[PDB]
Coordinates of C-alpha atoms in Angstrom, one line a residue:
Chain F
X1 CA 15.8 16.9 -13.7
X2 CA 17.3 18.0 -10.5
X3 CA 14.0 20.1 -9.3
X4 CA 11.8 17.4 -10.0
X5 CA 13.7 14.6 -8.3
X6 CA 14.4 16.9 -5.5
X7 CA 10.8 18.0 -5.2
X8 CA 9.5 14.5 -6.0
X9 CA 11.7 13.3 -2.8
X10 CA 10.5 15.9 -1.0
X11 CA 6.9 15.3 -1.5
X12 CA 7.5 11.4 -0.6
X13 CA 8.5 13.1 2.8
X14 CA 5.1 14.6 2.8
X15 CA 3.6 11.4 2.1
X16 CA 5.9 10.0 5.2
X17 CA 5.0 12.7 7.5
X18 CA 1.4 12.8 6.7
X19 CA 1.2 8.8 7.3
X20 CA 3.3 9.3 10.1
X21 CA 0.8 11.7 11.8
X22 CA -2.3 9.6 10.5
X23 CA -0.4 6.6 11.9
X24 CA 0.3 8.2 15.1
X25 CA -3.6 9.3 15.6
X26 CA -4.3 5.7 14.5
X27 CA -1.8 4.2 17.4
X28 CA -3.2 6.7 19.8
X29 CA -7.0 5.7 19.0
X30 CA -5.6 2.0 19.1
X31 CA -4.0 2.5 22.3
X32 CA -7.2 4.4 23.8
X33 CA -9.5 1.7 22.8
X34 CA -6.9 -0.9 23.9
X35 CA -6.8 0.7 26.8
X36 CA -10.6 1.0 27.4
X37 CA -11.0 -3.0 26.7
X38 CA -8.0 -3.5 29.2
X39 CA -9.8 -1.3 31.9
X40 CA -13.4 -3.6 31.0
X41 CA -11.2 -6.6 31.0
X42 CA -9.8 -6.3 34.4
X43 CA -13.4 -4.8 35.5
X44 CA -14.9 -7.9 34.5
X45 CA -12.1 -9.8 36.4
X46 CA -13.0 -8.3 39.5
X47 CA -17.1 -8.8 38.6
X48 CA -16.1 -12.4 38.1
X49 CA -14.5 -12.4 41.5
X50 CA -17.7 -10.7 42.8
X51 CA -20.2 -12.8 41.1
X52 CA -17.8 -16.2 42.4
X53 CA -18.4 -14.8 45.9
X54 CA -22.2 -15.0 45.2
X55 CA -22.2 -18.4 44.1
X56 CA -24.8 -20.8 45.6
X57 CA -28.6 -20.0 46.2
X58 CA -28.6 -16.4 47.6
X59 CA -29.9 -12.8 47.0
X60 CA -30.7 -12.9 43.3
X61 CA -30.8 -9.2 44.0
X62 CA -27.0 -9.7 44.6
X63 CA -26.1 -12.5 42.2
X64 CA -28.4 -11.9 39.4
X65 CA -28.0 -8.0 39.7
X66 CA -24.0 -8.5 39.7
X67 CA -24.8 -10.8 36.5
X68 CA -26.9 -8.3 34.8
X69 CA -23.9 -5.4 35.5
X70 CA -21.8 -8.0 33.9
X71 CA -23.9 -8.5 31.0
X72 CA -23.4 -4.4 30.5
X73 CA -19.7 -4.8 31.2
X74 CA -19.6 -7.7 28.5
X75 CA -21.4 -5.4 26.2
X76 CA -19.5 -2.4 26.6
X77 CA -16.3 -4.5 26.4
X78 CA -17.0 -6.4 23.4
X79 CA -18.5 -3.5 21.6
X80 CA -15.4 -1.6 22.1
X81 CA -13.0 -4.6 21.4
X82 CA -14.7 -4.5 17.9
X83 CA -14.2 -1.0 17.6
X84 CA -10.4 -0.8 18.4
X85 CA -10.2 -3.9 16.0
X86 CA -11.9 -1.4 13.4
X87 CA -9.3 1.0 14.2
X88 CA -6.5 -1.9 14.4
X89 CA -7.8 -3.0 10.8
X90 CA -7.7 0.4 9.8
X91 CA -4.1 0.8 11.5
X92 CA -2.7 -1.9 9.6
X93 CA -3.8 0.0 6.4
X94 CA -1.9 2.6 8.2
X95 CA 1.1 0.6 8.7
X96 CA 0.9 -0.7 5.2
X97 CA 0.7 2.9 3.7
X98 CA 3.8 4.3 5.8
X99 CA 5.6 1.1 4.6
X100 CA 4.4 1.5 1.1
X101 CA 5.6 5.4 1.6
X102 CA 9.1 4.2 2.9
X103 CA 9.7 2.0 -0.2
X104 CA 8.7 5.0 -2.6
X105 CA 11.2 7.2 -0.5
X106 CA 13.7 4.4 -1.4
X107 CA 12.6 4.1 -4.9
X108 CA 13.0 8.2 -5.2
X109 CA 16.1 8.2 -3.0
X110 CA 14.5 10.2 -0.1
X111 CA 16.6 7.3 2.2
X112 CA 16.7 9.6 5.2
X113 CA 12.8 9.8 5.0
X114 CA 12.6 5.9 3.9
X115 CA 14.6 5.4 7.2
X116 CA 12.6 8.0 9.2
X117 CA 9.6 6.2 8.3
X118 CA 10.9 2.6 8.9
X119 CA 11.8 3.9 12.4
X120 CA 8.2 5.2 13.1
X121 CA 6.6 2.3 11.9
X122 CA 8.8 0.3 14.2
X123 CA 8.5 2.7 17.3
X124 CA 4.6 2.2 16.6
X125 CA 4.4 -1.4 16.0
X126 CA 6.5 -1.9 19.4
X127 CA 4.6 0.4 21.3
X128 CA 1.2 -1.5 19.9
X129 CA 2.6 -4.9 20.4
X130 CA 3.5 -3.7 24.2
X131 CA 0.0 -2.6 24.8
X132 CA -0.8 -6.0 23.5
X133 CA 1.3 -7.7 26.1
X134 CA -0.8 -5.7 28.3
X135 CA -3.6 -6.8 26.7
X136 CA -2.5 -10.5 26.7
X137 CA -2.0 -10.0 30.3
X138 CA -5.7 -8.6 31.1
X139 CA -7.2 -11.4 28.9
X140 CA -5.0 -14.4 30.8
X141 CA -6.2 -12.8 34.5
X142 CA -9.7 -12.5 33.1
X143 CA -9.3 -16.3 31.9
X144 CA -7.9 -16.8 35.5
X145 CA -11.0 -15.4 36.8
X146 CA -13.5 -17.4 34.9
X147 CA -11.5 -20.4 35.6
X148 CA -11.9 -19.8 39.3
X149 CA -15.5 -19.2 38.7
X150 CA -15.9 -22.2 37.2
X151 CA -13.8 -24.3 40.0
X152 CA -16.4 -22.9 42.6
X153 CA -19.4 -22.8 40.5
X154 CA -19.1 -26.3 39.2
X155 CA -18.2 -27.6 42.9
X156 CA -21.3 -25.9 44.2
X157 CA -23.1 -27.5 41.3
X158 CA -21.9 -31.0 41.7
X159 CA -22.5 -30.8 45.4
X160 CA -26.1 -29.6 44.8
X161 CA -26.7 -32.5 42.5
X162 CA -25.2 -35.3 45.1
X163 CA -27.7 -33.8 47.6
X164 CA -30.3 -33.7 45.2
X165 CA -29.9 -37.5 44.3
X166 CA -30.0 -38.4 48.1
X167 CA -33.2 -36.3 48.4
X168 CA -34.7 -37.9 45.3
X169 CA -33.8 -41.2 47.0
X170 CA -35.8 -40.5 50.0
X171 CA -39.3 -41.3 48.5
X172 CA -41.1 -44.5 46.9
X173 CA -37.6 -46.2 46.4
Chain N
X1 CA -15.9 8.2 19.7
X2 CA -17.3 10.4 17.1
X3 CA -14.7 13.1 17.7
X4 CA -11.9 10.7 17.6
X5 CA -13.3 9.0 14.5
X6 CA -13.8 12.7 12.8
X7 CA -10.7 14.0 13.6
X8 CA -9.1 10.6 12.2
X9 CA -11.3 11.1 9.1
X10 CA -9.4 14.6 8.7
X11 CA -6.1 13.2 9.5
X12 CA -6.8 10.4 6.5
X13 CA -8.2 13.0 4.5
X14 CA -4.4 14.8 5.3
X15 CA -2.9 11.3 4.0
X16 CA -5.1 11.1 1.0
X17 CA -4.4 14.8 -0.2
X18 CA -0.7 14.5 0.6
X19 CA -0.5 11.4 -1.1
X20 CA -2.5 12.8 -3.8
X21 CA 0.3 15.8 -4.0
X22 CA 2.9 13.1 -4.0
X23 CA 1.0 11.3 -6.8
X24 CA 0.4 14.5 -8.6
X25 CA 4.2 15.1 -8.1
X26 CA 5.0 11.7 -9.5
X27 CA 2.5 12.1 -12.6
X28 CA 4.2 15.6 -13.4
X29 CA 7.8 14.0 -13.1
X30 CA 6.3 11.1 -15.1
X31 CA 4.7 13.3 -17.9
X32 CA 7.9 15.2 -18.0
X33 CA 10.2 12.1 -18.7
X34 CA 7.8 10.6 -20.9
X35 CA 7.6 13.9 -22.8
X36 CA 11.3 13.9 -23.1
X37 CA 11.3 10.2 -23.8
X38 CA 8.9 11.0 -26.7
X39 CA 10.8 13.9 -27.9
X40 CA 13.8 11.5 -28.2
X41 CA 11.8 8.9 -29.8
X42 CA 10.5 11.1 -32.5
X43 CA 14.0 12.6 -32.6
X44 CA 15.4 9.2 -33.5
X45 CA 12.4 8.6 -35.6
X46 CA 13.5 11.4 -37.9
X47 CA 17.1 10.8 -37.7
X48 CA 16.1 7.1 -38.9
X49 CA 14.4 8.7 -41.7
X50 CA 17.2 11.0 -42.5
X51 CA 19.9 7.9 -42.3
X52 CA 17.4 6.0 -44.6
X53 CA 18.0 9.0 -47.1
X54 CA 21.5 8.5 -46.9
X55 CA 21.4 4.7 -47.4
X56 CA 24.4 3.7 -49.9
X57 CA 27.6 5.4 -50.9
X58 CA 25.9 8.4 -51.7
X59 CA 27.6 10.3 -48.7
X60 CA 29.6 8.2 -46.5
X61 CA 31.3 11.1 -45.1
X62 CA 27.8 12.1 -44.0
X63 CA 26.3 8.6 -43.6
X64 CA 29.0 7.7 -40.9
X65 CA 28.6 11.1 -39.1
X66 CA 24.8 10.9 -38.9
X67 CA 25.4 7.4 -37.7
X68 CA 27.5 8.6 -34.9
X69 CA 24.8 11.4 -34.1
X70 CA 22.4 8.4 -34.2
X71 CA 24.6 6.8 -31.5
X72 CA 23.9 9.5 -29.2
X73 CA 20.3 9.8 -29.9
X74 CA 19.8 6.0 -28.9
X75 CA 21.9 6.4 -25.8
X76 CA 19.9 9.5 -24.9
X77 CA 16.5 8.0 -25.8
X78 CA 17.3 4.6 -24.1
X79 CA 18.9 6.0 -21.0
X80 CA 15.4 8.3 -20.7
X81 CA 13.2 5.2 -21.2
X82 CA 14.7 3.5 -18.4
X83 CA 14.6 6.7 -16.5
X84 CA 10.9 7.4 -17.0
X85 CA 10.2 3.4 -16.5
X86 CA 11.9 3.9 -13.0
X87 CA 9.7 7.0 -12.5
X88 CA 6.4 5.1 -13.5
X89 CA 7.5 2.6 -11.2
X90 CA 7.4 4.7 -8.6
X91 CA 4.1 6.4 -10.1
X92 CA 2.7 3.0 -9.6
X93 CA 3.9 2.9 -6.3
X94 CA 2.1 6.2 -5.7
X95 CA -0.9 5.1 -7.2
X96 CA -0.8 1.9 -4.9
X97 CA -0.4 4.6 -2.0
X98 CA -3.3 6.9 -3.1
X99 CA -5.5 3.5 -3.3
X100 CA -4.5 2.4 0.0
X101 CA -5.5 5.9 1.2
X102 CA -8.5 5.8 -0.6
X103 CA -9.5 2.4 0.9
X104 CA -8.6 3.5 4.4
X105 CA -10.6 6.7 3.8
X106 CA -13.5 4.3 2.9
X107 CA -12.8 2.1 5.9
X108 CA -12.7 5.3 8.0
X109 CA -15.8 6.8 6.7
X110 CA -14.3 9.7 5.1
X111 CA -16.3 9.1 2.0
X112 CA -15.9 12.7 0.8
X113 CA -11.8 12.0 0.9
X114 CA -12.0 8.7 -0.5
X115 CA -14.4 9.3 -3.2
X116 CA -12.3 12.7 -4.1
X117 CA -9.1 10.6 -3.9
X118 CA -10.3 7.8 -6.4
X119 CA -11.8 10.1 -8.7
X120 CA -8.3 12.1 -8.9
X121 CA -6.5 8.5 -9.2
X122 CA -9.2 8.0 -12.2
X123 CA -8.1 11.7 -13.7
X124 CA -4.1 11.0 -12.8
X125 CA -4.4 7.6 -14.5
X126 CA -6.5 8.8 -17.6
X127 CA -4.0 11.5 -18.1
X128 CA -1.0 9.6 -17.5
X129 CA -2.5 7.0 -20.1
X130 CA -3.0 10.0 -22.4
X131 CA 0.7 11.2 -22.3
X132 CA 1.3 7.2 -22.7
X133 CA -1.0 6.7 -25.5
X134 CA 0.9 9.7 -27.2
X135 CA 4.3 7.7 -26.1
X136 CA 2.9 4.3 -27.6
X137 CA 2.1 6.2 -30.9
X138 CA 5.7 7.5 -30.9
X139 CA 7.2 3.8 -30.3
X140 CA 4.7 2.7 -32.9
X141 CA 6.3 5.4 -35.2
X142 CA 9.7 4.6 -33.9
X143 CA 9.2 0.9 -35.0
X144 CA 7.8 1.7 -38.2
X145 CA 10.9 4.2 -39.4
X146 CA 13.0 1.2 -38.2
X147 CA 11.2 -1.2 -40.1
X148 CA 11.3 1.0 -43.1
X149 CA 14.9 1.6 -42.6
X150 CA 15.6 -1.8 -42.6
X151 CA 13.2 -2.8 -45.8
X152 CA 15.2 0.2 -47.4
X153 CA 18.7 -1.0 -46.5
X154 CA 18.1 -4.4 -47.1
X155 CA 16.9 -3.7 -50.8
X156 CA 19.0 -1.4 -51.8
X157 CA 22.2 -2.8 -50.4
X158 CA 20.7 -6.5 -51.9
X159 CA 20.4 -5.4 -55.5
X160 CA 23.8 -3.2 -54.9
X161 CA 25.2 -6.7 -53.7
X162 CA 24.0 -8.4 -56.5
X163 CA 25.5 -6.0 -59.0
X164 CA 28.7 -6.3 -57.0
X165 CA 28.7 -10.0 -57.6
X166 CA 27.9 -9.5 -61.3
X167 CA 30.7 -6.8 -61.2
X168 CA 33.4 -9.1 -59.4
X169 CA 32.2 -11.9 -62.1
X170 CA 33.5 -9.5 -64.9
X171 CA 37.3 -10.0 -64.1
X172 CA 39.4 -13.1 -64.1
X173 CA 36.5 -15.5 -63.7

């Protein structure tokens, strides 16, 4: 049936282009929320630098208010992280749909659509892995700011502890 | 982002309805192929019944020609069997697509789309298995016709062979 196979191939092109537009919106929402995460990560990094500058006993109206804002930032970042992961779960469903559509296109013989799908899938996956590289960069720089905050905080902590032992030794002993 | 997720939900609704279009197209192509297969099946069935009526020497100058026609019938039926099985593989591919789309619609909260798709799949799968039930009836009746053809051939030619042995024993022995 010439018409039947011709139209069915074309319909699989509809599945491919619908799933492509969907996957594009999904990539865009994913990139958007990845971007918001990246922003929040870099923000938290700067906030770690700020809070680290406030280490040692000083104005809580600075130190612990910066900590409170850090709590707000953490909640924002984490909720957005969970939301981009919700999107990314749907995104893996979308990629899976596009791949299954490309296989339907092959099985029907819309190999031009199968190829265009596979290309679109790869372009999306590449762009996603690239913004994932940005994510890993941001997360590494946040981890570095955590490590600096650890170095400073712990340093001060141990110093104070030593002094506290020396001050406890002042009496009755 | 409620706007983002709502546009996403409509996008997935588009994937779900365009995949429902492809699934409909593939179901119609499948139903067509099933129908033409079932036609060739009932054809070969009746042809076997006719040929069974031609068993023995009664009209070899006809039995051999109905046999020749049966060869073409077998070829057409079997190539259509293989074809509609390729098509049904593609249909199960389309069902898998619509199922992954209904699941993405659920994961996206396009519940109206998800449920519409799920019941569309149920309708399609039932209608397919309805034509498949007709096909399985036809396959049962083809099997029955072949079985009775073999019964009739093995009986009539077995008794004629016994008579041929008895007639060969009449001479020189």
